[PDB]
Design a protein around this ligand. Structure first.
Ligand SMILES: [Mg+2]
Ligand SMILES: [Mg+2]
Ligand SMILES: [Mg+2]
Ligand SMILES: [Mg+2]
Ligand SMILES: [Mg+2]
Ligand SMILES: [Mg+2]
Ligand SMILES: [Mg+2]
Ligand SMILES: [Mg+2]
Ligand SMILES: [Mg+2]
Ligand SMILES: [Mg+2]
Ligand SMILES: [Mg+2]
Ligand SMILES: [Mg+2]
Ligand SMILES: [Mg+2]
Ligand SMILES: [Mg+2]
Ligand SMILES: [Mg+2]
Ligand SMILES: [Mg+2]
Ligand SMILES: [Mg+2]
Ligand SMILES: [Mg+2]
Ligand SMILES: [Mg+2]
Ligand SMILES: [Mg+2]
Ligand SMILES: [Mg+2]
Ligand SMILES: [Zn+2]
Lengths: 174, 37, 213, 60, 146
RNA sequence: CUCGAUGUCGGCUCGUCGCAUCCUGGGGCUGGAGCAGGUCCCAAGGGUUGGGCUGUUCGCCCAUUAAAGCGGCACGCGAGC
RNA sequence: ACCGCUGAAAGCAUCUAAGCGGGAAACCUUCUCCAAGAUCAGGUUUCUCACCCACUUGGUGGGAUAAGGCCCCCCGCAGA
């Protein structure tokens, strides 16, 4: 079903096609993507994005619903940029900005610094709460998955870095 | 994981999927991770 | 920025430092050198610098080798060797005719010293590879220093390539790593290098700065 | 087979076309014309190609 | 008396084969026949007939995705445990001319005259060859229709 | 297969190879609080001690060790002892 | 091995089918050594850079030399 549904475009000032290619630009930075070769991307009446396919294969149905939710991440990620929201639990654990970087005090014998790459901006809101922002959904969630594995998963005291709202498993201990 | 040539779901929320050419069981309870090898 | 010099080993002696410990040094005359040729990557394919060393009579050097010095404007020397640099920024500090001396090394720096090890002749297996031999008694017939077995049986019907055996030993290029520089004497042109330096007392020695530090 | 393929036909179909036209030249002399007289070998290709059936894959 | 060629009758020429999308099996076969002279009607298996082959663009040959990972190249040095192995995918980065040249030299006959045949083969990686003093004519792959 | 000869245990000497891994290296699960473990998966680069008893292999014992691995190679190796 | 992010076929979900990461004494570079007999026999330089004779006038035979090396001589911590 996904892929058989158009892409709503709020602004999309240069949603273009140049020989099996696509680009986007708007209030934020620009983003590029190349759809796989059987899947054609085309226009609706509103200048929007509607993708097509040859019909009923094992491999063309897969690349169609895939390549819908990759093009729509561009026109969402430029208008409404993605922010992952993470929290710090445990007694004595905290987080600060050393400039553009992000230090952690996770019970180690050294402060763990995380060098922020291009396109990613860190921001804290509390000593136990912070956010990771950007425009690319894969590039944001890759950085937020590096921070989640900074400590070993601890099922006894809950000491670690988490996503907000998620519920890790807990054991009884002694 | 458990590495046994016979894998099957144990509880009612174990999915049974296929990745990288081998059949494995993922779940929420971590003692139900199984694969074939 | 790997510096290097050619020199002559002069023997060993001992010296005392500030903590009143004894330090076995090995005197190396890091003599005056000169460049005579620069290997550039666009002309020769790599980056290096020749170094000429040693006093010699100008009649003992033949006409093919004399003319290689006339193209550089240097009197003929005895030895001639290359210092291998990295693959970029070749000769911004080496010119043809530049005099290199012994005080390019600082006190307390580390050096890597390469020369030719002393010869030991046709050496048996207990000296060359450190075997054990059979016993000295308890019946051992004529095998007191012999290597024993050298293979299996009908499988495999061959001695493997690389089996350790008797043969000549010495005359090998041996590099000794991370030697401490106790004192450089700029008045005499002498490095006091802590430890052992391979060679007979008078052989050629290349003293290069360490990479392992 | 080397000289049939300078005249865009396989050896597979040259022997078929020279039996469908009644040319009983043996392979010794057919390989001696190919070296010594090449214009007399193109004519034996055009005899064997024209005498070949039109759909060579259709059953007889 | 069938024809056996004299010395001084084998006339050689210069071909150049581009390899921009050609698989390694189609190109090693068409270079092996062209070096030995199977395409010439004056063929004799004991005479080094055949032309020169210049293979340009060997870093762009068509090898599948599952062969740049799992197809191995073995050498043995003679010393025990001296078996080494490198994948095709880590030979197509350093020495891409050796991958095309190994596929040709396994398709020549295993005899003495193939060591003179393989002296007529130049394999390069880029699109540029030094043999412009000669005039190499290009050679495209053709299949005779049947 | 070998009877017009293929010299057999154990030890010494020198090896080489497999991984069904003893130590060290990387992990999942745990009836894993920690420290130590149990179990499974990945991994063969190097290391794997010296004595008492016995012809011994094996095995028990002593003092250690990061550990004192299991096997193939004519139960490797007597034109080497 | 194991852990992932994005993400369908399968409106959910899933480390995967397109695509991208983290990952060990194993592998490959790095460090030491041998190595162009690597017959694809390599590279940058320097020196000599020259005569005479006969014949069946040949990528022919000889002779005499340059640059240069070897033998002999004095030896070595180099060595059967
Ligand atoms: Mg994997
Ligand atoms: Mg001696
Ligand atoms: Mg002894
Ligand atoms: Mg005797
Ligand atoms: Mg004796
Ligand atoms: Mg055969
Ligand atoms: Mg007999
Ligand atoms: Mg464990
Ligand atoms: Mg294993
Ligand atoms: Mg071992
Ligand atoms: Mg290694
Ligand atoms: Mg006693
Ligand atoms: Mg063994
Ligand atoms: Mg035995
Ligand atoms: Mg045994
Ligand atoms: Mg015995
Ligand atoms: Mg024997
Ligand atoms: Mg590493
Ligand atoms: Mg060398
Ligand atoms: Mg070789
Ligand atoms: Mg040479
Ligand atoms: Zn379960």
């Amino acid at each position: 079903r996904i892929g058989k549904q158009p892409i709503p475009v709020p602004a999309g000032v240069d949603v273009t096609i140049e020989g099996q290619s696509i680009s986007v630009k708007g209030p934020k930075g620009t983003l590029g993507l190349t759809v796989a070769e059987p899947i054609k991307v085309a226009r609706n009446d509103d200048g929007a994005i509607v993708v097509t396919r040859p019909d009923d294969e094992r491999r063309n149905r897969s690349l169609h619903g895939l390549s819908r939710t990759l093009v729509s991440n561009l026109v969402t990620g430029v208008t409404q940029g993605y922010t992952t929201k993470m929290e710090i639990f445990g007694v004595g654990y905290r987080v600060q900005l050393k400039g553009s970087n992000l230090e952690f005090a996770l019970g180690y014998s050294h402060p763990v610094v995380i060098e922020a790459p291009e396109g990613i901006t860190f921001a804290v809101q509390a000593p136990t709460k912070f956010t990771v922002s950007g425009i690319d959904k894969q590039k944001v969630g890759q950085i937020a998955a590096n921070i989640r594995r900074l400590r070993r998963p601890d099922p006894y005291k809950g000491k670690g870095v988490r996503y907000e709202g998620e519920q890790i498993r807990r054991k009884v201990g002694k | 994981v458990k590495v046994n040539p016979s894998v099957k779901p144990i509880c009612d929320k174990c999915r049974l999927i296929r990745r990288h050419g081998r059949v494995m069981v993922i779940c929420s309870d971590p003692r139900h991770k199984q694969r074939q090898g | 920025a790997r510096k290097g010099i050619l020199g002559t080993k002069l023997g060993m002696t001992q010296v005392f430092d500030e903590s009143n410990r004894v330090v076995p040094v090995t005197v190396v005359k890091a003599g005056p050198n000169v460049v005579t040729r620069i290997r550039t990557p666009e002309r020769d394919g790599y980056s290096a610098v020749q170094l000429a060393y040693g006093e010699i009579s100008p009649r003992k050097v033949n006409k093919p080798l004399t003319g290689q010095y006339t193209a550089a404007g240097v009197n003929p020397r005895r030895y001639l060797a290359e210092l291998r640099l990295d693959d970029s920024d070749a000769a911004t500090e080496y010119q043809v005719g530049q005099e290199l001396t012994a005080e390019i090394f600082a006190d307390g720096s580390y050096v890597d010293v390469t020369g030719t090890s002393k010869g030991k002749g046709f050496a048996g297996t207990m000296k060359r590879h450190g075997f054990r031999g059979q016993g000295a008694s308890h019946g051992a017939q004529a095998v007191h220093r012999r290597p024993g077995s050298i293979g299996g049986c009908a499988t495999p019907a061959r001695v493997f390539k690389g089996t350790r055996m008797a043969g000549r030993m010495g005359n090998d290029r041996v590099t000794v790593l991370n030697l401490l520089v106790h004192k450089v004497d700029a008045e005499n042109g002498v490095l006091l290098i802590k430890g052992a330096v391979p060679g007979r007392t008078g052989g050629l020695v290349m003293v290069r700065s360490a990479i392992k530090r | 087979n080397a000289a049939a393929r300078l005249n865009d036909i396989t050896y597979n179909r040259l022997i078929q076309g020279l039996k469908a036209a009644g040319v009983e030249v043996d392979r010794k002399n057919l390989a001696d014309i190919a070296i010594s007289d090449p214009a007399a070998f193109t004519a034996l290709v055009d005899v064997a190609r024209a005498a070949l059936p039109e759909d060579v894959n259709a059953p007889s | 008396p069938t024809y056996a060629p004299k010395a001084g009758d084998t006339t050689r020429s210069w071909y150049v084969i581009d390899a921009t999308d050609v698989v390694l099996g189609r190109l090693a076969v068409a270079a092996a026949n062209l070096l030995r002279g199977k395409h010439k009607p004056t063929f004799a298996p004991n005479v080094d007939g055949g032309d020169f082959v210049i293979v340009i663009n060997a870093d762009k040959v068509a090898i599948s995705g599952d062969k740049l990972q799992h197809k191995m190249v073995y050498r043995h040095s003679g010393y025990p445990g001296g078996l080494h192995k490198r994948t095709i995918g880590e030979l197509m980065q350093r020495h891409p001319d050796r991958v095309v040249e190994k596929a040709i030299l396994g398709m020549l006959p295993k005899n003495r005259l193939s060591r003179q045949i393989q002296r007529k083969l130049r394999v390069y990686a880029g699109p540029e060859h030094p043999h412009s003093a000669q005039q190499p004519v290009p050679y495209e792959l053709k299949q005779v229709a049947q």
